[PDB]
mmCIF file of all heavy atoms in Angstrom:
data_model
loop_
_atom_site.group_PDB
_atom_site.id
_atom_site.type_symbol
_atom_site.label_atom_id
_atom_site.label_comp_id
_atom_site.label_asym_id
_atom_site.label_seq_id
_atom_site.Cartn_x
_atom_site.Cartn_y
_atom_site.Cartn_z
ATOM 1 N N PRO W 1 5.596 -4.444 3.859
ATOM 2 C CA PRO W 1 4.549 -5.429 4.190
ATOM 3 C C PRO W 1 3.362 -4.867 4.958
ATOM 4 O O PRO W 1 2.243 -5.336 4.744
ATOM 5 C CB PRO W 1 5.297 -6.489 5.009
ATOM 6 C CG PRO W 1 6.602 -5.918 5.321
ATOM 7 C CD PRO W 1 6.914 -4.994 4.215
ATOM 8 N N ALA W 2 3.567 -3.894 5.849
ATOM 9 C CA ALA W 2 2.449 -3.335 6.607
ATOM 10 C C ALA W 2 1.466 -2.602 5.703
ATOM 11 O O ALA W 2 0.245 -2.799 5.808
ATOM 12 C CB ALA W 2 2.970 -2.404 7.697
ATOM 13 N N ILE W 3 1.971 -1.742 4.817
ATOM 14 C CA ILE W 3 1.088 -1.018 3.908
ATOM 15 C C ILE W 3 0.473 -1.991 2.897
ATOM 16 O O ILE W 3 -0.671 -1.807 2.460
ATOM 17 C CB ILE W 3 1.853 0.159 3.258
ATOM 18 C CG1 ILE W 3 1.023 0.890 2.215
ATOM 19 C CG2 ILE W 3 3.109 -0.280 2.608
ATOM 20 C CD1 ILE W 3 -0.255 1.434 2.773
ATOM 21 N N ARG W 4 1.207 -3.055 2.535
ATOM 22 C CA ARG W 4 0.633 -4.123 1.717
ATOM 23 C C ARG W 4 -0.552 -4.791 2.411
ATOM 24 O O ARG W 4 -1.584 -5.035 1.781
ATOM 25 C CB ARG W 4 1.712 -5.153 1.382
ATOM 26 C CG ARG W 4 1.181 -6.485 0.879
ATOM 27 C CD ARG W 4 2.299 -7.498 0.581
ATOM 28 N NE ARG W 4 3.489 -6.969 -0.080
ATOM 29 C CZ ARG W 4 3.537 -6.435 -1.296
ATOM 30 N NH1 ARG W 4 2.480 -6.408 -2.092
ATOM 31 N NH2 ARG W 4 4.689 -5.938 -1.738
ATOM 32 N N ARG W 5 -0.422 -5.081 3.712
ATOM 33 C CA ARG W 5 -1.531 -5.633 4.494
ATOM 34 C C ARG W 5 -2.720 -4.683 4.538
ATOM 35 O O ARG W 5 -3.874 -5.117 4.430
ATOM 36 C CB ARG W 5 -1.070 -5.938 5.916
ATOM 37 C CG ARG W 5 -0.108 -7.090 6.049
ATOM 38 C CD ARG W 5 -0.106 -7.624 7.463
ATOM 39 N NE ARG W 5 1.208 -8.121 7.843
ATOM 40 C CZ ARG W 5 2.155 -7.375 8.397
ATOM 41 N NH1 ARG W 5 1.959 -6.093 8.658
ATOM 42 N NH2 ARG W 5 3.327 -7.929 8.690
ATOM 43 N N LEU W 6 -2.452 -3.390 4.743
ATOM 44 C CA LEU W 6 -3.520 -2.390 4.782
ATOM 45 C C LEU W 6 -4.266 -2.318 3.457
ATOM 46 O O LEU W 6 -5.495 -2.198 3.437
ATOM 47 C CB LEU W 6 -2.956 -1.021 5.136
ATOM 48 C CG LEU W 6 -2.651 -0.792 6.608
ATOM 49 C CD1 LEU W 6 -1.704 0.373 6.761
ATOM 50 C CD2 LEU W 6 -3.934 -0.547 7.368
ATOM 51 N N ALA W 7 -3.537 -2.367 2.341
ATOM 52 C CA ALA W 7 -4.189 -2.430 1.039
ATOM 53 C C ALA W 7 -4.942 -3.735 0.857
ATOM 54 O O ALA W 7 -5.983 -3.765 0.193
ATOM 55 C CB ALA W 7 -3.163 -2.255 -0.073
ATOM 56 N N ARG W 8 -4.413 -4.822 1.412
ATOM 57 C CA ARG W 8 -5.044 -6.122 1.265
ATOM 58 C C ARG W 8 -6.372 -6.205 2.003
ATOM 59 O O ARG W 8 -7.271 -6.928 1.560
ATOM 60 C CB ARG W 8 -4.100 -7.210 1.745
ATOM 61 C CG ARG W 8 -4.357 -8.503 1.067
ATOM 62 C CD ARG W 8 -3.920 -8.517 -0.389
ATOM 63 N NE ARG W 8 -2.480 -8.588 -0.578
ATOM 64 C CZ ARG W 8 -1.888 -8.506 -1.761
ATOM 65 N NH1 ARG W 8 -2.588 -8.359 -2.872
ATOM 66 N NH2 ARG W 8 -0.565 -8.592 -1.832
ATOM 67 N N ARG W 9 -6.495 -5.534 3.156
ATOM 68 C CA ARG W 9 -7.787 -5.490 3.843
ATOM 69 C C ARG W 9 -8.860 -4.816 2.994
ATOM 70 O O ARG W 9 -10.031 -5.206 3.048
ATOM 71 C CB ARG W 9 -7.664 -4.783 5.194
ATOM 72 C CG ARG W 9 -8.934 -4.903 6.037
ATOM 73 C CD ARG W 9 -8.793 -4.456 7.477
ATOM 74 N NE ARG W 9 -8.449 -5.568 8.349
ATOM 75 C CZ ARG W 9 -8.160 -5.443 9.636
ATOM 76 N NH1 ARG W 9 -8.184 -4.267 10.238
ATOM 77 N NH2 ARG W 9 -7.837 -6.526 10.336
ATOM 78 N N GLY W 10 -8.481 -3.849 2.168
ATOM 79 C CA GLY W 10 -9.445 -3.219 1.293
ATOM 80 C C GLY W 10 -9.846 -4.011 0.073
ATOM 81 O O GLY W 10 -10.631 -3.519 -0.740
ATOM 82 N N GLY W 11 -9.340 -5.230 -0.085
ATOM 83 C CA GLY W 11 -9.690 -6.053 -1.219
ATOM 84 C C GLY W 11 -8.878 -5.817 -2.465
ATOM 85 O O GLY W 11 -9.361 -6.113 -3.561
ATOM 86 N N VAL W 12 -7.668 -5.295 -2.347
ATOM 87 C CA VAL W 12 -6.842 -4.976 -3.505
ATOM 88 C C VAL W 12 -5.973 -6.186 -3.829
ATOM 89 O O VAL W 12 -5.345 -6.763 -2.937
ATOM 90 C CB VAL W 12 -5.991 -3.727 -3.235
ATOM 91 C CG1 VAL W 12 -5.000 -3.514 -4.341
ATOM 92 C CG2 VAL W 12 -6.881 -2.522 -3.074
ATOM 93 N N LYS W 13 -5.940 -6.577 -5.104
ATOM 94 C CA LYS W 13 -5.194 -7.764 -5.508
ATOM 95 C C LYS W 13 -3.760 -7.462 -5.928
ATOM 96 O O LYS W 13 -2.853 -8.232 -5.600
ATOM 97 C CB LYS W 13 -5.929 -8.470 -6.644
ATOM 98 C CG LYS W 13 -5.421 -9.846 -7.016
ATOM 99 C CD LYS W 13 -5.938 -10.225 -8.390
ATOM 100 C CE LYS W 13 -5.684 -11.679 -8.706
ATOM 101 N NZ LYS W 13 -6.440 -12.119 -9.907
ATOM 102 N N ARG W 14 -3.527 -6.375 -6.656
ATOM 103 C CA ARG W 14 -2.192 -6.054 -7.144
ATOM 104 C C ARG W 14 -1.813 -4.640 -6.732
ATOM 105 O O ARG W 14 -2.654 -3.743 -6.676
ATOM 106 C CB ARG W 14 -2.096 -6.194 -8.665
ATOM 107 C CG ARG W 14 -2.200 -7.619 -9.155
ATOM 108 C CD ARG W 14 -2.095 -7.687 -10.663
ATOM 109 N NE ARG W 14 -0.816 -8.216 -11.117
ATOM 110 C CZ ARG W 14 0.233 -7.469 -11.429
ATOM 111 N NH1 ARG W 14 0.189 -6.151 -11.351
ATOM 112 N NH2 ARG W 14 1.350 -8.059 -11.842
ATOM 113 N N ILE W 15 -0.525 -4.452 -6.464
ATOM 114 C CA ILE W 15 0.006 -3.227 -5.887
ATOM 115 C C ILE W 15 1.105 -2.705 -6.800
ATOM 116 O O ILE W 15 2.029 -3.447 -7.135
ATOM 117 C CB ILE W 15 0.562 -3.495 -4.476
ATOM 118 C CG1 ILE W 15 -0.559 -3.778 -3.487
ATOM 119 C CG2 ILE W 15 1.344 -2.318 -3.974
ATOM 120 C CD1 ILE W 15 -1.552 -2.688 -3.411
ATOM 121 N N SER W 16 1.019 -1.441 -7.197
ATOM 122 C CA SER W 16 2.107 -0.876 -7.986
ATOM 123 C C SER W 16 3.314 -0.589 -7.103
ATOM 124 O O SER W 16 3.204 -0.392 -5.892
ATOM 125 C CB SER W 16 1.684 0.400 -8.699
ATOM 126 O OG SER W 16 0.861 0.097 -9.806
ATOM 127 N N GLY W 17 4.487 -0.560 -7.732
ATOM 128 C CA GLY W 17 5.713 -0.320 -6.995
ATOM 129 C C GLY W 17 5.886 1.107 -6.529
ATOM 130 O O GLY W 17 6.623 1.345 -5.568
ATOM 131 N N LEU W 18 5.231 2.059 -7.183
ATOM 132 C CA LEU W 18 5.377 3.463 -6.833
ATOM 133 C C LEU W 18 4.333 3.942 -5.838
ATOM 134 O O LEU W 18 4.370 5.113 -5.447
ATOM 135 C CB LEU W 18 5.304 4.342 -8.086
ATOM 136 C CG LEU W 18 6.154 4.016 -9.318
ATOM 137 C CD1 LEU W 18 5.393 3.164 -10.325
ATOM 138 C CD2 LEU W 18 6.643 5.296 -9.973
ATOM 139 N N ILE W 19 3.386 3.089 -5.441
ATOM 140 C CA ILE W 19 2.271 3.563 -4.630
ATOM 141 C C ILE W 19 2.682 3.821 -3.180
ATOM 142 O O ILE W 19 2.057 4.658 -2.521
ATOM 143 C CB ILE W 19 1.083 2.582 -4.733
ATOM 144 C CG1 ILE W 19 -0.228 3.263 -4.357
ATOM 145 C CG2 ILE W 19 1.253 1.384 -3.835
ATOM 146 C CD1 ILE W 19 -1.389 2.789 -5.179
ATOM 147 N N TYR W 20 3.741 3.158 -2.688
ATOM 148 C CA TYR W 20 4.083 3.194 -1.263
ATOM 149 C C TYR W 20 4.447 4.592 -0.779
ATOM 150 O O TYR W 20 4.049 4.991 0.324
ATOM 151 C CB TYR W 20 5.217 2.217 -0.965
ATOM 152 C CG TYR W 20 4.961 0.808 -1.436
ATOM 153 C CD1 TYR W 20 5.773 0.214 -2.389
ATOM 154 C CD2 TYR W 20 3.920 0.060 -0.906
ATOM 155 C CE1 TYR W 20 5.542 -1.080 -2.809
ATOM 156 C CE2 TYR W 20 3.684 -1.233 -1.318
ATOM 157 C CZ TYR W 20 4.498 -1.796 -2.269
ATOM 158 O OH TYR W 20 4.272 -3.084 -2.684
ATOM 159 N N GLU W 21 5.197 5.350 -1.583
ATOM 160 C CA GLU W 21 5.512 6.728 -1.218
ATOM 161 C C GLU W 21 4.253 7.587 -1.167
ATOM 162 O O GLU W 21 4.128 8.467 -0.308
ATOM 163 C CB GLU W 21 6.518 7.329 -2.198
ATOM 164 C CG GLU W 21 7.924 6.755 -2.123
ATOM 165 C CD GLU W 21 8.074 5.456 -2.886
ATOM 166 O OE1 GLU W 21 7.157 5.117 -3.661
ATOM 167 O OE2 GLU W 21 9.110 4.779 -2.723
ATOM 168 N N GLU W 22 3.308 7.332 -2.073
ATOM 169 C CA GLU W 22 2.044 8.064 -2.074
ATOM 170 C C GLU W 22 1.231 7.781 -0.814
ATOM 171 O O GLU W 22 0.664 8.702 -0.210
ATOM 172 C CB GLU W 22 1.244 7.730 -3.326
ATOM 173 C CG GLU W 22 0.058 8.632 -3.521
ATOM 174 C CD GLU W 22 0.376 9.808 -4.411
ATOM 175 O OE1 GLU W 22 1.513 9.876 -4.917
ATOM 176 O OE2 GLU W 22 -0.504 10.669 -4.600
ATOM 177 N N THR W 23 1.136 6.502 -0.416
ATOM 178 C CA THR W 23 0.425 6.178 0.822
ATOM 179 C C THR W 23 1.116 6.764 2.045
ATOM 180 O O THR W 23 0.441 7.220 2.976
ATOM 181 C CB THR W 23 0.252 4.673 1.004
ATOM 182 O OG1 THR W 23 1.429 4.123 1.608
ATOM 183 C CG2 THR W 23 -0.094 3.976 -0.281
ATOM 184 N N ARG W 24 2.452 6.743 2.070
ATOM 185 C CA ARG W 24 3.175 7.378 3.170
ATOM 186 C C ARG W 24 2.880 8.873 3.232
ATOM 187 O O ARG W 24 2.671 9.424 4.320
ATOM 188 C CB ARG W 24 4.675 7.125 3.048
ATOM 189 C CG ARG W 24 5.111 5.776 3.591
ATOM 190 C CD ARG W 24 6.604 5.560 3.422
ATOM 191 N NE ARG W 24 6.988 4.167 3.615
ATOM 192 C CZ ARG W 24 7.446 3.377 2.656
ATOM 193 N NH1 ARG W 24 7.589 3.809 1.417
ATOM 194 N NH2 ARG W 24 7.768 2.121 2.949
ATOM 195 N N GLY W 25 2.820 9.531 2.071
ATOM 196 C CA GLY W 25 2.503 10.952 2.038
ATOM 197 C C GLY W 25 1.106 11.278 2.537
ATOM 198 O O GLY W 25 0.920 12.215 3.323
ATOM 199 N N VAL W 26 0.100 10.523 2.078
ATOM 200 C CA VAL W 26 -1.270 10.819 2.508
ATOM 201 C C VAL W 26 -1.461 10.492 3.993
ATOM 202 O O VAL W 26 -2.159 11.224 4.716
ATOM 203 C CB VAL W 26 -2.308 10.123 1.599
ATOM 204 C CG1 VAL W 26 -2.160 8.639 1.578
ATOM 205 C CG2 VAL W 26 -3.716 10.490 2.008
ATOM 206 N N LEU W 27 -0.828 9.414 4.481
ATOM 207 C CA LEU W 27 -0.876 9.100 5.908
ATOM 208 C C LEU W 27 -0.211 10.197 6.734
ATOM 209 O O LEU W 27 -0.722 10.573 7.797
ATOM 210 C CB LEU W 27 -0.218 7.748 6.171
ATOM 211 C CG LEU W 27 -0.055 7.343 7.635
ATOM 212 C CD1 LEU W 27 -1.413 7.231 8.290
ATOM 213 C CD2 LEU W 27 0.699 6.035 7.747
ATOM 214 N N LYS W 28 0.919 10.725 6.249
ATOM 215 C CA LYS W 28 1.584 11.842 6.912
ATOM 216 C C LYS W 28 0.698 13.080 6.966
ATOM 217 O O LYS W 28 0.650 13.765 7.989
ATOM 218 C CB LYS W 28 2.897 12.164 6.203
ATOM 219 C CG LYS W 28 3.733 13.207 6.914
ATOM 220 C CD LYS W 28 5.216 12.904 6.796
ATOM 221 C CE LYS W 28 5.772 13.351 5.455
ATOM 222 N NZ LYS W 28 5.871 14.836 5.365
#
């Protein structure tokens, strides 16, 4: 939910299921 909220602030409507590991990697 937190990374979903972060994507939602950017105006994103739909989220792929595989994106969360990618966002965790780039944040790391």
